[PDB]
Amino acid sequence: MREIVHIQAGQCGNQIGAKFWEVISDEHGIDPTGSYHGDSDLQLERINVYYNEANKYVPRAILVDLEPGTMDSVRSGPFGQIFRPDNFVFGQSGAGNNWAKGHYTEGAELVDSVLDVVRKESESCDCLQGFQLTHSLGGGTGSGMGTLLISKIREEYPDRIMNTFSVMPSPKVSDTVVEPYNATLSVHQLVENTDETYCIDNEALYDICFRTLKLTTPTYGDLNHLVSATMSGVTTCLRFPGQLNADLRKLAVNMVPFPRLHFFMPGFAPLLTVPELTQQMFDSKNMMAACDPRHGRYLTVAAIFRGRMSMKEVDEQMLNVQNKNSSYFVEWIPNNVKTAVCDIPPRGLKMSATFIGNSTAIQELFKRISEQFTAMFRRKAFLHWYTGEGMDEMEFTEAESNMNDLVSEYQQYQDATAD
Amino acid sequence: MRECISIHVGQAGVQIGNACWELYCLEHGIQPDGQMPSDKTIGGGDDSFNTFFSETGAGKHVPRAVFVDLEPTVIDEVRTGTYRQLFHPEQLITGKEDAANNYARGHYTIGKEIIDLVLDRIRKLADQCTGLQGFLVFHSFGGGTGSGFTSLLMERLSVDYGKKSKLEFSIYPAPQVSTAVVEPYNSILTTHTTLEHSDCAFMVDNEAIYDICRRNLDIERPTYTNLNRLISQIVSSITASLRFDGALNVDLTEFQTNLVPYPRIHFPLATYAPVISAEKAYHEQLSVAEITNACFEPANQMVKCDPRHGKYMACCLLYRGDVVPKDVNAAIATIKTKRSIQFVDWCPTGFKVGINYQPPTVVPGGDLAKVQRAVCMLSNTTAIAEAWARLDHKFDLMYAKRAFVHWYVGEGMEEGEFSEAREDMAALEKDYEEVGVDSV
Amino acid sequence: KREHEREVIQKAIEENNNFIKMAKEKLAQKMESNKENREAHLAAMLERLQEKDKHAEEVRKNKELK
Numbered sequence: 055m056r057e058i059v060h061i062q063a064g065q066c067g068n069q070i071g072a073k074f075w076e077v078i079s080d081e082h083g084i085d086p087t088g089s090y091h092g093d094s095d096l097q098l099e100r101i102n103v104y105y106n107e108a109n110k111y112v113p114r115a116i117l118v119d120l121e122p123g124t125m126d127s128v129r130s131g132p133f134g135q136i137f138r139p140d141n142f143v144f145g146q147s148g149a150g151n152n153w154a155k156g157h158y159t160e161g162a163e164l165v166d167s168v169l170d171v172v173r174k175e176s177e178s179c180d181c182l183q184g185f186q187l188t189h190s191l192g193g194g195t196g197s198g199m200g201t202l203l204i205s206k207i208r209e210e211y212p213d214r215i216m217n218t219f220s221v222m223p224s225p226k227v228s229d230t231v232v233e234p235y236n237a238t239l240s241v242h243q244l245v246e247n248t249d250e251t252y253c254i255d256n257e258a259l260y261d262i263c264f265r266t267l268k269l270t271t272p273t274y275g276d277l278n279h280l281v282s283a284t285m286s287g288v289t290t291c292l293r294f295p296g297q298l299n300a301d302l303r304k305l306a307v308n309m310v311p312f313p314r315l316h317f318f319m320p321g322f323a324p325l326l327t328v329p330e331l332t333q334q335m336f337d338s339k340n341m342m343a344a345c346d347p348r349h350g351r352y353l354t355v356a357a358i359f360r361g362r363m364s365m366k367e368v369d370e371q372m373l374n375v376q377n378k379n380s381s382y383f384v385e386w387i388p389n390n391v392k393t394a395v396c397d398i399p400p401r402g403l404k405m406s407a408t409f410i411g412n413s414t415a416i417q418e419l420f421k422r423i424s425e426q427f428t429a430m431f432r433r434k435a436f437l438h439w440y441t442g443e444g445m446d447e448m449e450f451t452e453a454e455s456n457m458n459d460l461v462s463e464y465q466q467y468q469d470a471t472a473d
Numbered sequence: 474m475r476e477c478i479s480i481h482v483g484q485a486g487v488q489i490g491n492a493c494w495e496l497y498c499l500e501h502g503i504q505p506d507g508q509m510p511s512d513k514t515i516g517g518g519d520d521s522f523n524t525f526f527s528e529t530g531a532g533k534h535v536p537r538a539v540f541v542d543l544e545p546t547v548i549d550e551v552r553t554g555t556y557r558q559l560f561h562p563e564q565l566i567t568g569k570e571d572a573a574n575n576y577a578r579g580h581y582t583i584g585k586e587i588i589d590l591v592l593d594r595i596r597k598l599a600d601q602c603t604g605l606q607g608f609l610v611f612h613s614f615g616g617g618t619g620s621g622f623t624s625l626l627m628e629r630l631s632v633d634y635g636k637k638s639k640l641e642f643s644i645y646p647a648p649q650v651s652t653a654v655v656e657p658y659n660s661i662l663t664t665h666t667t668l669e670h671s672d673c674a675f676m677v678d679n680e681a682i683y684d685i686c687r688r689n690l691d692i693e694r695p696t697y698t699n700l701n702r703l704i705s706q707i708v709s710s711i712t713a714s715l716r717f718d719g720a721l722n723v724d725l726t727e728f729q730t731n732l733v734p735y736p737r738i739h740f741p742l743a744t745y746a747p748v749i750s751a752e753k754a755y756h757e758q759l760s761v762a763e764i765t766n767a768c769f770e771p772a773n774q775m776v777k778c779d780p781r782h783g784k785y786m787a788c789c790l791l792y793r794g795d796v797v798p799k800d801v802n803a804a805i806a807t808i809k810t811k812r813s814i815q816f817v818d819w820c821p822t823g824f825k826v827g828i829n830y831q832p833p834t835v836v837p838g839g840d841l842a843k844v845q846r847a848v849c850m851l852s853n854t855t856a857i858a859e860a861w862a863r864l865d866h867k868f869d870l871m872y873a874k875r876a877f878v879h880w881y882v883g884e885g886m887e888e889g890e891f892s893e894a895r896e897d898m899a900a901l902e903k904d905y906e907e908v909g910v911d912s913v
Numbered sequence: 914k915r916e917h918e919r920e921v922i923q924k925a926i927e928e929n930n931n932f933i934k935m936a937k938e939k940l941a942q943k944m945e946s947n948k949e950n951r952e953a954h955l956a957a958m959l960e961r962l963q964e965k966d967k968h969a970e971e972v973r974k975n976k977e978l979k
């Protein structure tokens with residue numbers, strides 16, 4: 055079929071990736087041992103996209119880390135042994151929440167063994183569409199090693215699609231002060247080397263856990279259930295029989311008007327009625343970024359509706375959201391909101407709506423990181439941890455410069471008219 | 474003699490071909506295994522249905538058809554469907570990797586690796602012919618394959634078969650059932666590239682077909698299947714000239730003569746009637762006059778345009794069933810009085826009429842009611858240019874900001890192709906205007 | 914008149930042939946310029962990645978001196 059290759063790098067990466075494999079393995083009727091046990095045939099029709107077949111099924115996944123902890127955790131836990139044991143690739147050193155270490159020194163040791171497993175999976179594919187990477191941008195392994203992998207893989211498969219779920223750092227969720235540096239460095243890489251990045255901002259997941267789910271003390275599991283829900287959502291049209299945006303590439307084509315602006319904002323409901331699903335979905339209190347879309351303009355949007363409902367209601371409500379708030383949709387990309395429906399709902403819910411936005415409000419997120427970066431950089435603070443691995447401020451200077459440029463571009467198009 | 478090879482390209486093409494060939498088989502009494510109990514001439518013959526259907530000495534009737542998708546699915550269903558035995562395996566060519574809604578991928582990157590194979594299959598089919606007329610090419614404007622690979626195929630077919638007739642059935646994009654945001658790009662691109670290589674194209678606007686299915690057949694949210702069976706009806710009306718016979722039948726090629734005034738003005742507007750539901754049809758017989766008038770109702774049109782805002786250069790009426798000349802004639806008059814069919818000053822203002830008495834068939838379990846007579850009108854209105862305008866305008870909105878253009882340049886294309894295509898469409902809009910102006 | 918008839922059919926044959934020929938040319942020019950363009954783009958992409966590689970070696974060497 056059209057095969058995706060999935061990569062988990064780092065702690066956060068392997069955590070959200072393991073949850074994602076649990077969630078969609080359930081959706082597709084795959085027990086923790088790799089045996090199909092579901093009713094519908096619609097669960098196995100496109101199962102080739104995310105699973106190799108061995109009567110058993112094995113996630114086409116590659117698990118990567120510079121420390122053995124999180125990956126042991128994964129081998130041990132739920133669906134722990136659905137993964138090909140060969141595909142665990144791990145060092146012992148760790149990366150010390152250091153971008154330079156994952157990208158230049160420790161990651162460089164491990165990267166060739168990763169690429170080895172990557173070749174093995176890619177060359178067992180009829181038609182490889184591309185690669186999907188999960189990682190945070192705030193630590194060291196995921197951030198730096200992941201971006202290094204992105205480059206390596208592009209070098210070897212320059213014609214395939216690079217796709218990442220990249221977790222953006224937020225003070226309210228961590229403490230590692232350098233996170234802005236790490237993030238600004240990998241945003242740099244991502245601007246250049248991915249076709250589509252879902253921006254999962256920890257800030258928003260926090261807020262939605264706190265001030266909506268009303269969880270006063272959220273754990274990383276609380277955030278990661280929002281994350282795995284989103285990932286199922288944005289992978290539905292790829293995992294189940296359907297049409298609109300079914301390939302990573304068609305997705306790229308229908309969502310990326312200009313090659314740099316490929317940073318998407320996901321949203322999900324219910325965190326009902328087609329109206330309730332639709333309005334919740336488009337509200338900010340359901341965005342997984344932090345930006346308010348009412349602050350910028352939708353360039354492109356794709357909505358997925360899962361469950362049994364009326365497509366007539368879905369079309370009416372979708373056009374109602376646009377026609378009503380037609381101010382927040384650019385007029386130089388006609389008919390830029392597409393909608394798909396899949397009958398199979400996520401676990402536990404009978405109806406659900408996921409949403410993917412190329413919105414200029416994403417500038418807010420980059421702006422936030424930019425600020426945090428400059429605070430420290432204006433006094434060269436904590437730079438020693440990096441300079442010592444062989445880096446030069448120019449690099450930081452370039453990365454900050456590139457991200458400022460990204461923000462400036464998102465603003466320009468937001469302020470563009472047709473006539 | 475007089476054979477027509479049909480080529481179905483990309484999803485829309487293949488699925489519409491599914492509709493058409495099933496309809497055809499019903500109209501001719503061919504069972505899903507190719508056996509036609511009515512045929513007594515075994516392994517061959519020169520019957521009219523032979524223009525679309527070769528025969529095996531084992532008695533199977535085989536569509537003179539090729540299905541081409543850059544992607545396994547759809548076609549695969551044909552291979553595994555009620556009609557899997559009508560076709561032979563090499564008539565269904567599939568790729569591995571579609572065009573991701575990108576004409577540069579269909580026309581070059583991905584298409585170039587399957588084109589020679591497709592041309593060989595087409596040649597296999599051609600060499601089975603004793604006097605081949607030309608091709609019926611079925612494709613969407615908006616698909617990556619349907620636009621790019623189709624235009625490639627058209628160029629190569631003009632090379633390998635010369636000025637043989639090539640006729641298009643084109644699915645014009647409508648947001649209601651859209652799949653890509655770049656479909657205006659693909660549309661302008663493919664129109665500009667094909668303009669020179671096609672003698673007659675029937676544009677079918679998905680928005681018009683969606684609307685009719687909803688209002689006349691009462692369908693909440695019509696499906697591709699709903700649309701495709703309505704469309705196949707229209708196609709069958711257009712091709713029934715070549716698949717059946719009779720003393721009142723007229724060959725489309727004759728209409729073509731009257732439908733294409735100048736080589737570029739080769740986009741005829743179609744209107745079909747009656748599109749009703751069984752519920753309604755029950756105890757409601759439509760008269761020739763009824764169906765005819767409908768033909769002049771802008772709502773029963775296949776493309777959204779206001780013929781009144783333009784002039785006519787041809788009006789051909791193709792009837793099917795219990796239709797007799799007298800009845801038609803009257804209707805025509807009545808209309809001509811009650812209506813205003815303005816014509817250009819250089820064109821005769823009469824209506825060319827044809828009748829096939831073979832009554833229309835319905836797909837069982839379908840939404841269309843079996844009917845006693847129907848008509849498909851084919852006109853050349855400068856008004857069709859409206860549908861170009863819309864497309865052109867959308868294209869312009871995007872192109873001014875170069876939106877999505879990178880996806881094409883990254884596949885080999887140049888911004889220049891965009892501007893040339895666009896300029897060609899500008900020319901096309903000017904051309905239509907010109908032909909509609911009166912003379913000295 | 915017979916010569917005129919021979920000239921007209923000659924004109925028809927020549928014009929169809931010229932059509933097929935100009936088509937063949939135009940298409941070959943297009944396919945070749947597309948292939949040159951696409952290759953160029955992928956080459957420059959792979960070369961950007963190569964400069965990325967050379968700068969990584971630069972970084973590792975800069976540290977194995979500190």
Ligand SMILES: Nc1nc2c(ncn2[C@@H]2O[C@H](COP(=O)(O)OP(=O)(O)OP(=O)(O)O)[C@@H](O)[C@H]2O)c(=O)[nH]1
Pocket residue numbers: 063064065066067069070120121148149150151152190191192193194195196197221222223224227228233256259274275277278281
């Ligand atoms: N949403 C979410 N964020 C996480 C999770 N685990 C870690 N993080 C975030 O990850 C960022 C740091 O990334 P890590 O995964 O710890 O970094 P790493 O790739 O393991 O790099 P090393 O620490 O050097 O091994 C912080 O900003 C955390 O907020 C998780 O399970 N869910």
Ligand SMILES: Nc1nc2c(ncn2[C@@H]2O[C@H](COP(=O)(O)OP(=O)(O)OP(=O)(O)O)[C@@H](O)[C@H]2O)c(=O)[nH]1
Pocket residue numbers: 482483484485486488489542543544571572573574575613614615616617618619620644646647650651652653656679697700701
């Ligand atoms: N009327 C009708 N329109 C269709 C049908 N199938 C697809 N379309 C329309 O076709 C356009 C998209 O073109 P497709 O035929 O899907 O694309 P394709 O030829 O496979 O090209 P790629 O998938 O990019 O390779 C959209 O505007 C759809 O509305 C159909 O079966 N009937």
Ligand SMILES: [Ca+2]
Pocket residue numbers: 512513514515516517518519520528
């Ligand atoms: Ca026979």
Ligand SMILES: [Mg+2]
Pocket residue numbers: 065193
């Ligand atoms: Mg950590």
Ligand SMILES: [Mg+2]
Pocket residue numbers: 483484544571616618
């Ligand atoms: Mg397709």
